[PDB]
Design a protein around this ligand. Structure first.
Ligand SMILES: CCCCCCCCCCCCCCCCCC(=O)OC[C@H](COP(=O)([O-])OCC(O)COP(=O)([O-])OC[C@@H](COC(=O)CCCCCCCCCCCCCCCCC)OC(=O)CCCCCCCCCCCCCCCCC)OC(=O)CCCCCCCCCCCCCCCCC
Ligand SMILES: CCCCCCCCCCCCCCCCCC(=O)OC[C@H](COP(=O)([O-])OCC[N+](C)(C)C)OC(=O)CCCCCCCCCCCCCCCCC
Ligand SMILES: NC(=O)C1=CN([C@@H]2O[C@H](COP(=O)(O)OP(=O)(O)OC[C@H]3O[C@@H](n4cnc5c(N)ncnc54)[C@H](OP(=O)(O)O)[C@@H]3O)[C@@H](O)[C@H]2O)C=CC1
Ligand SMILES: CCCCCCCCCCCC(=O)SCCNC(=O)CCNC(=O)[C@H](O)C(C)(C)COP(=O)(O)O
Ligand SMILES: [Zn+2]
Lengths: 430, 40, 86, 94, 338, 181, 47, 198, 91, 69
């Protein structure tokens, strides 16, 4: 329902011109030339040490590639400014941050264990597929919150004690996994985004290797990660490290990020340039605002959670004076004096091929033969978890992103369904 | 006989071939792709 | 020279039949121009310079002054390609 | 191998996973990725696999400067030599 | 306030330029051209007018500037009512003023009214309306308080009043503009055709002239709108070169093939006759007075180069407008075909 | 929409199936020469209705595009544009349309500026070229048309339902013994 | 004379511009604090 | 079909090197017959028609062309049979059809010619049938057929100083340019096209 | 009676209501809503009422049938073609 | 006449070099020959028009011609 009725957000609260905010806080419209010139002057003045960036939720391959090239030419290497929550996963191998088993792997696995994941709220179609699989042959276990899943599940726990026991092998679920053939482990990105995300990730790696989730004889790799940000998936695909965080940044480039932003993340004295399409959030932290295109208005590439690379096509042109984000970055680089080697989509995609060629095979999942190496458990790692519950980030299914927040149908759905769906208890009927 | 008679015959031959549509062609669910791992 | 540029844009043709058809059309349009069948403003589109100002008008170099030594991509980006009102 | 972090800003290996032309680089990466990672904990070592792709080692040094080395039909010793040259040339580059 | 104007000039008549413009005094020679300049890119154009006769082609052709739904004609305009101006410029972010004393008017009171009262009221209305981003008033080159010409004398005060009321107003001071419907080339042709033997001059014909093409003037208007910094400054627009009246006569004669003949009438008697008899387009005191005066671009204000418009030379620009009126002497048989 | 396998084996047919490999000409392309080589090595060598990997082919402004008619003094943007070639299936709303779809390849052009005029709120298109889609019986014909007219083309291959066993007896199934665990 | 209302309504049917803050406003670090303009009531937060 | 009808087999009896493909349907008149004729024999066939005894009293009623490249069966796709004439439309660039009426035989004869060459070359017959002049001029201009040995190739029903083939399925009904009046040029000009979409 | 309240939305089919009925004058360029609201509820004995929007076929809207046997007794039901509201004469 | 064609430098002009050396393609050559015909009010037969290879040949032909104005 979100993907069916959230397009209404694109119809209002749309930024349609470059804007600048005065110290008093009075926004005023300006020309693209003026905005780019002032941004370039700020970039030249600011040393590369105190320049940082934030990746948005709806960032695409082309935009992230242009931003990465521009920051590299400016000598900026840190692409995160938020320190509260960062995804703890290395972008070296695709196998270590993509679902090794495809979306159809649930139809093949016999046991599926979720860690901090709520498929009903995130990827409901995946939840329906899991329902089909569990009705045919599949047993579902859950470590975290006990959400009202449409199918029966075995709730092992909510703390990291269960993970510690499984890793140590004293938990009976270790024997259960060993008995089971083609087991699958699905972990939500929030669990890896926890402060101990690296420790939890290492614990999952060792558990998978010990229990055979990654088996050469079975030729099976059941380790999976369910993401919550298409922009984060694209950044990982292009190789941007999510852990690289600039603690103190004087010049912040927010590429359409509206979730998790807080005043503490942006230093009071910083200069903020926000590439965005809606003004719900991130447009109030911005000293300069640059309109960008949406997914229905940008001819770009998108990599989904399972690693499938698809092409998002242009339906209608960006509203008002909005420009494509990659074009904006190209113009900014040229004005700042570090021109990028691509002037069109074809040349930008040639650069994308330079970085990672597999993104030029649209609607296809490129296999990787380094899954075992990437997910192998190293010796001497921390693997020390915290005694706290594992939770799910989604609270209101109908309000998760800026477009949904700006949508009217989503607001009607929220007011009509939140009170009826909220329940601190579990539906024992199912 | 003129030179183009062969081309005309080719056109007539190709015009008589049976034709089917992708929409009505059966497609079976592919089997699970066997994951491969680099040795050593 | 302008009509020469027009022909140069089409010089890549390698089909004798298409070339013959094009020559027939060209002779027809030339005859129309001779006989005043066409209007001067309608037929001067073939003779007009590709990148040079018309000799009977004063040209504006504001765009060149503003975007001196800037890539065509940046010039087009600043110019825009869609009305901004809607 | 211990100075990769300071010498370079990124290392990338783009190759094919089922081609003899890439076999050498493929095997070298599979064998030495963890060694290099342990030597340089936080350095970015990206690995990308695409069928029928030319082997390439891309070293990004600084200020958006990159050098691409064609590593086709190269033994593991040749890959070691190329990587060592790329690491050592950082001083000359900057 | 803000003088910025965001408009798209890459579209044709059916596009949306982003300019909503009210053009006062568009029934003159230059009015249709200025209106078409904005209309052809998709801008909305309003033409307030109180013109006699209503059925004149001058009023009629204003509808061709933009098209259907974009060009509007506001008839029976009252020039002494502020509500009329408010209605005219209510939805316009551009206000162009070309309301100046006609060459047919010799009354100082009427000239002052046209060149001062209307301009000041338009400027006051623009000041009242906060949505009027740009104001472009059309003055005359050589405007001065000591100028003998009542037109120039009143136009200087008019531009001063416009600047006082609306400090962000842009004042143009074009030189003698020529074109198909101008008062210079057409007047030359018509006078020589009506006399058939001479053009009647009333001075030594040493006055300097710097003609500019109306297309160049329109391009200057567009460039001034594009350039935000042009607001609140005075511009003098003219051709690349300066010619005297005698040189202009010689150039026109050479271009058209018509032998020149200038018949001199004493300036004093001509002035007395024109000031004591009825005046119309082809017989007026303003022409007699302006014959002696110099109407050229001075270095005291900004020039056309500042607007970044390269005007075309007078010999090249005026040649096309005299093709029909060409001397028919000895010509080749091939040229006889026509 | 599918002639018999290897029914046509003409040189022209094989040429239509084959896609050219780009040659770096622009300065940007020369700078990205490695990218061009990678794209040439990776993209599918030939186009057939049995293909499964989508790809984008640049416009081939060569002697082959001499048959285009959309290169005129007034308009010079139609040629070299990029189209989309895919099968348009029936909407999910209904299953038995009066005029069924999915029996032909649709060629589409991304729409340019679309604005509602102020006087009446009527929709206007900046360009009139991309209003209607084009239809072809075969992907080979569509690609041949693109090559002849000098348009670049993305190709996205269709996806259809997987055949599954269907039987009314599946409604009645014996769950099993009660004691079963 | 009221063409502006109709034009704005037609433009908003497809795309409604975001109303940016004007004048002096409260600041929390590098953030401008503005009350939500959504007519809908946040029932879950209220109760 | 309760009339006396005979196939026009004389053409194929005389032109012994050609194969016959003929149709008659109740969708047409009782005395109407369609046939397939190759382009390289079209001119000679018309020569024979114009002066054969029983075909002497023959008049070229109509002539036109069809852009068969974009032809698709939108309904009842499976009902198509190999004997239907529609099978020759698929994958063929153009199909030019002529229609004649014969008075001696009280018959109507249509000939279909398939053009597969990209330049659409075909021999004209306006030198045999006088009224074919303007018919072929219209066909050539509207569909771009390159008629050869034609009496007059000048356009007919198309605007001055313009080159286009509007009837091709690629072309859009709204055209590519609109004619307005320019005040600066004081005359009618032609510029790019912007139209209304319902 | 807040038009955006959950109760109001549920009662009005999740549409924002206009009690004054004046906004329609601009939204739909007519006062037909105000005019039709004046007609009172028509009470019909039968459980099902037939409406043709006139006195004879083809003089109104297509013949339609409205169920007056609501799950809650006496609830008026509005015709879709015309705004006439019919209710069962509960006794 | 050549002054119109700004590709060629009239200063260091060799009358024996080919039009291609001067910097004129076939279309430029045809335009230049037509311009020379207009200048001298003459008409080059097809054979000589196509046979011209440099400016010296044109000069010699015009010198021999008596109708040149
Ligand atoms: C009968 C009773 C018995 C007793 C006898 C009584 C007297 C009998 C008289 C018999 C002859 C009568 C002849 C006139 C008939 C009626 C027409 C007429 O009056 O002229 C208007 C008529 C209007 O011109 P048109 O060709 O019809 O216009 C066509 C379009 O409108 C033009 O279209 P366009 O698009 O080309 O427009 C161009 C522009 C014009 O073109 C231009 O743009 C360039 C010119 C602009 C300035 C024009 C200023 C005026 C120029 C006057 C020129 C006069 C001609 C001679 C010049 C000689 C120079 C050396 O248009 C105009 O402005 C048109 C001209 C306007 C003229 C306004 C003044 C006219 C009335 C006063 C004339 C006085 C002339 C005195 C001459 C000396 C007499 C000794 O023609 C003239 O203007 C020339 C008239 C010349 C003769 C005047 C005779 C009356 C005065 C004689 C002196 C006093 C009496 C002496 C005898 C007393 C005996 C007791
Ligand atoms: C059959 C009818 C014939 C009618 C012929 C009429 C001839 C002209 C009569 C003029 C009467 C003037 C009365 C006194 C004016 C007082 C005002 C003044 O200041 O005097 C100086 C006037 C004023 O002109 P001015 O330019 O000096 O000053 C303007 C006035 N102030 C300063 C107040 C603003 O000028 C004159 O010399 C007299 C008026 C000349 C008018 C010329 C146009 C006449 C139009 C006639 C139309 C009818 C045509 C009939 C034939 C139609 C055939 C189809
Ligand atoms: N050679 C030239 O063209 C030059 C022109 N200019 C300036 O540019 C302006 C436009 O050029 P141009 O078209 O030639 O000028 P015009 O004389 O042709 O036009 C003047 C306009 O003002 C109107 N007008 C005149 N008097 C009044 C009045 N008392 N009250 C209200 N409206 C009046 C006129 O309408 P109506 O028809 O009803 O009288 C007309 O529309 C000139 O007015 C002049 O100020 C400056 C230098 C040279
Ligand atoms: C009065 C207004 C008339 C306007 C007419 C408008 C209509 C014009 C009709 C179309 C005319 C054409 O394009 S006709 C198209 C003709 N085709 C070709 O030219 C392809 C083969 N080209 C060559 O042989 C050379 O390139 C060549 C460039 C000839 C010489 O070059 P130089 O050896 O190097
Ligand atoms: Zn009813």
């Amino acid at each position: 329902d979100k993907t069916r009725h959230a397009f209404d957000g694109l119809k209002r609260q749309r930024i349609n011109s470059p804007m600048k905010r005065s110290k008093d806080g009075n926004y005023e419209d300006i020309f693209w030339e003026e905005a780019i010139q002032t941004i370039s002057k700020k970039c030249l003045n600011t040393p590369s040490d105190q320049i940082g960036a934030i990746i948005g939720e709806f960032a695409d391959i082309e935009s992230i590639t242009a931003l990465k090239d521009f920051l590299n030419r400016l000598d900026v290497d840190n692409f995160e400014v938020r320190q509260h929550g960062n995804l703890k996963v290395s972008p070296d191998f695709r196998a270590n941050y993509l679902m090794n088993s495809k979306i159809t792997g649930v139809e093949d696995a016999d046991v599926l264990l979720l860690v901090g994941c709520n498929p009903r709220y995130e990827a409901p179609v995946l939840n329906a597929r899991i329902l089909k699989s569990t009705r045919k042959n599949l047993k579902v276990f859950n470590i975290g919150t006990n959400q009202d899943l449409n199918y029966k599940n075995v709730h092992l726990g909510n703390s990291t004690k269960v993970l510690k026991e499984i890793a140590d092998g004293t938990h009976p679920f270790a024997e259960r996994l060993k008995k089971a053939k083609l087991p699958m482990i699905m972990v939500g990105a929030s669990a890896l985004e926890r402060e101990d995300g690296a420790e939890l990730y290492n614990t999952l790696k060792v558990i998978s290797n010990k229990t055979g989730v990654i088996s050469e004889e079975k030729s099976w790799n059941g380790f999976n990660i369910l993401h919550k940000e298409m922009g984060r998936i694209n950044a990982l695909e292009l190789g941007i490290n999510p852990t690289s965080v600039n603690k103190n940044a004087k010049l912040v480039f927010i590429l359409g990020a509206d979730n998790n932003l807080r005043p503490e993340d942006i230093p009071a004295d910083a200069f903020v340039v926000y590439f965005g399409t809606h003004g719900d959030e991130g447009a109030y932290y911005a000293d300069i605002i640059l309109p960008t295109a949406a997914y229905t208005e940008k001819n770009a590439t998108w990599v989904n959670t399972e690693g499938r690379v698809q092409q998002g096509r242009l339906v209608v042109m960006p509203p008002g004076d909005a420009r494509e984000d990659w074009q904006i970055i190209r113009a900014l680089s040229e004005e700042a004096g570090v021109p990028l080697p691509y002037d069109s989509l074809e040349e930008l995609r040639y650069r994308v091929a330079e970085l990672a060629p597999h993104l030029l095979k649209y609607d296809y999942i490129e296999p990787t033969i380094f899954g075992k190496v990437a997910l192998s458990a190293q010796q001497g790692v921390k693997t020390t978890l915290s005694p706290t519950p594992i939770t799910d980030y989604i609270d209101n299914f109908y309000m998760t992103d800026a477009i949904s927040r700006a949508s009217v149908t989503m607001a009607k759905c929220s007011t009509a369904f939140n009170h009826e769906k909220f329940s601190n208890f579990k539906n024992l009927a199912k | 006989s003129r030179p183009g008679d062969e081309e005309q015959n080719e056109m007539i031959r190709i015009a008589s071939q049976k034709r089917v549509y992708l929409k009505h062609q059966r497609v079976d669910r592919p089997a699970r792709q066997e994951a491969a791992f680099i040795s050593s | 020279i302008n009509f020469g540029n027009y022909i140069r844009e089409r010089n890549h043709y390698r089909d004798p039949g298409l070339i013959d058809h094009r020559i027939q059309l060209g002779y027809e349009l030339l005859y129309e121009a001779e006989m005043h069948f066409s209007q001067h403003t309608i037929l001067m589109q073939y003779l007009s310079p590709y990148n040079t100002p018309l000799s009977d008008r004063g040209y504006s170099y504001l765009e060149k002054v503003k975007y001196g030594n800037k890539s065509k991509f940046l010039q087009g980006f600043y110019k825009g390609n869609k009305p901004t009102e809607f | 191998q211990k100075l990769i972090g300071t010498n370079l800003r990124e290392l990338r290996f783009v190759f094919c996973q089922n081609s003899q032309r890439s076999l050498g680089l493929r095997n070298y990466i599979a064998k030495n990725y963890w060694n290099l990672k342990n030597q340089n904990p936080n350095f970015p070592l990206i690995v990308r696999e695409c069928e029928e792709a030319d082997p390439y080692i891309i070293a990004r040094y600084q200020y958006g400067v990159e050098k691409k080395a064609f590593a086709a039909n190269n033994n593991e010793a040749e890959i070691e030599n190329i990587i060592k040259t790329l690491v050592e040339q950082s001083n000359k580059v900057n | 306030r803000s003088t910025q104007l965001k408009f798209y000039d890459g579209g044709n008549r059916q596009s949306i330029s982003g300019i909503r413009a009210t053009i006062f005094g568009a029934t003159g020679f230059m009015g249709p051209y200025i209106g078409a300049a904005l209309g052809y890119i998709g801008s909305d154009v309003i033409f307030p007018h109180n013109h006699v006769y209503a059925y004149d082609d001058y009023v009629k052709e204003l509808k061709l500037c933009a098209g259907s739904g974009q060009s509007y004609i506001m008839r029976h305009f009252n020039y002494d009512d502020d509500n009329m101006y408010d209605m005219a410029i209510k939805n316009s972010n551009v206000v162009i003023n070309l309301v100046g004393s006609r060459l047919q008017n010799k009354n100082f009171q009427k000239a002052a009214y046209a060149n001062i009262h209307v301009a000041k009221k338009i400027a006051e209305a623009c000041a009242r309306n906060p949505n009027v981003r740009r104001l472009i008033h059309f003055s005359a080159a050589g405007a001065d308080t000591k100028s003998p010409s009542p037109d120039l004398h009143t136009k200087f005060h008019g531009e001063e009043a416009v600047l006082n009321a609306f400090p962000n107003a842009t004042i143009f001071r074009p030189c003698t503009v020529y074109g198909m419907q101008d008062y210079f080339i057409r007047h030359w042709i018509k006078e020589r055709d009506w006399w058939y033997h001479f053009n009647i001059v009333t001075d030594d014909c040493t006055a300097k002239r710097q003609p500019i093409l109306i297309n160049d003037v329109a391009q200057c208007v567009l460039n001034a709108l594009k350039l935000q910094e042009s607001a609140g400054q005075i511009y003098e627009l003219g051709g690349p070169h300066v010619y005297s009246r005698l040189e202009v006569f010689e150039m026109l004669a050479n271009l058209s093939g018509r032998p020149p003949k200038l018949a001199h009438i004493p300036h004093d008697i001509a002035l007395k006759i024109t000031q004591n008899f009825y005046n119309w387009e082809f017989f007026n005191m303003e022409k007699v007075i302006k014959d002696k005066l110099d109407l050229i671009v001075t270095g005291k204000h900004k020039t056309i180069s500042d607007l970044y418009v390269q005007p075309v030379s007078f010999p090249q620009g005026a040649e096309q407008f005299i093709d029909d009126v060409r001397y028919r002497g000895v010509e080749t048989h091939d040229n006889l075909e026509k | 929409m599918l002639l018999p396998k290897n029914a046509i084996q003409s040189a022209r047919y094989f040429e239509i199936q084959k896609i050219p490999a780009k040659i770096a000409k622009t300065a940007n392309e020369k700078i990205l020469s490695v990218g061009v080589a990678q794209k040439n090595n990776i993209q599918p060598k030939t186009v057939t209705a049995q293909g499964q990997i989508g790809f984008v082919q640049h416009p081939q402004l060569d002697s082959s595009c001499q048959y285009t008619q959309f290169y005129t003094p007034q308009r010079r943007d139609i040629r070299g544009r990029v189209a989309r070639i895919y099968i348009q299936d029936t909407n999910h709303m209904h299953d038995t349309p009066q005029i069924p779809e999915g029996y032909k390849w649709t060629l589409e052009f991304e729409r340019q500026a679309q604005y509602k005029t102020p006087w009446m709120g009527w929709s206007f298109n900046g360009d009139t070229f991309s209003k209607r889609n084009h239809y072809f019986c075969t992907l080979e014909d569509a690609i041949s048309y693109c090559k002849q007219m000098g348009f670049g083309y993305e190709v996205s291959f269709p996806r259809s339902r997987y055949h599954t066993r269907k039987s009314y007896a599946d409604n009645m199934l014996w769950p099993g013994h009660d004691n079963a665990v | 004379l009221n063409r502006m209302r109709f034009i704005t309504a037609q433009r908003d049917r497809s795309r409604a511009p975001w109303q940016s803050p004007k004048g002096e406003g409260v600041f929390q670090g590098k953030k401008l604090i503005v009350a939500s303009n959504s007519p809908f009531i946040d029932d879950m937060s209220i109760r | 079909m309760q009339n006396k009808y005979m196939q026009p087999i004389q053409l194929f009896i005389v032109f012994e090197k050609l194969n016959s493909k003929m149709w008659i349907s109740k969708k047409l008149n009782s005395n109407h017959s369609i046939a397939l004729i190759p382009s390289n024999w079209f001119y000679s066939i018309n020569l024979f028609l114009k002066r054969e005894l029983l075909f002497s009293n023959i008049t070229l009623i109509e002539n036109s062309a069809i852009d068969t490249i974009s032809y698709n069966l939108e309904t009842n796709q499976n009902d198509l049979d190999k004997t239907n004439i529609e099978n020759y439309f698929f994958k063929n660039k153009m199909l030019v059809f002529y229609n004649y009426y014969n008075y001696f035989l009280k018959s109507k004869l249509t000939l279909f010619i398939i053009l597969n060459n990209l330049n659409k070359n075909i021999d004209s017959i306006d030198r045999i049938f006088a009224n074919a002049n303007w018919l072929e001029r219209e066909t050539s201009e509207m569909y771009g057929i390159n008629y050869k040995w034609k009496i007059d190739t000048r356009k007919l029903l198309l605007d001055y100083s313009k080159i286009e083939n509007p009837m091709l399925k690629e072309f859009q009904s709204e055209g590519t340019q609109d004619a307005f009046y320019n005040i600066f040029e004081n005359q009618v000009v032609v510029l790019k096209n912007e139209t209304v979409e319902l | 009676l807040n038009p955006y309240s959950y109760e109001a939305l549920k009662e009005n089919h999740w549409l924002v209501s206009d009690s004054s009925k004046k906004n329609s004058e601009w939204t739909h360029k007519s006062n037909a809503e105000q005019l039709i609201a004046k007609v009172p509820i028509i009470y019909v004995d039968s459980n099902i009422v037939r409406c043709i929007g006139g006195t004879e076929i083809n003089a109104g809207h297509p013949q339609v049938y409205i169920q007056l046997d609501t799950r809650k007794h006496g609830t008026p039901q509005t015709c879709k073609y015309c705004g006439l509201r019919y209710a069962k004469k509960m006794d | 006449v050549l002054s119109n064609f700004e590709q060629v430098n009239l200063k260091n002009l060799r009358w024996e070099q080919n039009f291609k050396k001067l910097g004129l393609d076939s279309l430029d050559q045809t335009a230049l020959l037509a311009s020379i015909e207009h200048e001298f009010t003459i008409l080059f037969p097809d054979g000589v028009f196509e046979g011209f290879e440099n400016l010296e040949q044109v000069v010699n032909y015009i010198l021999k011609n008596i109708n040149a104005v």
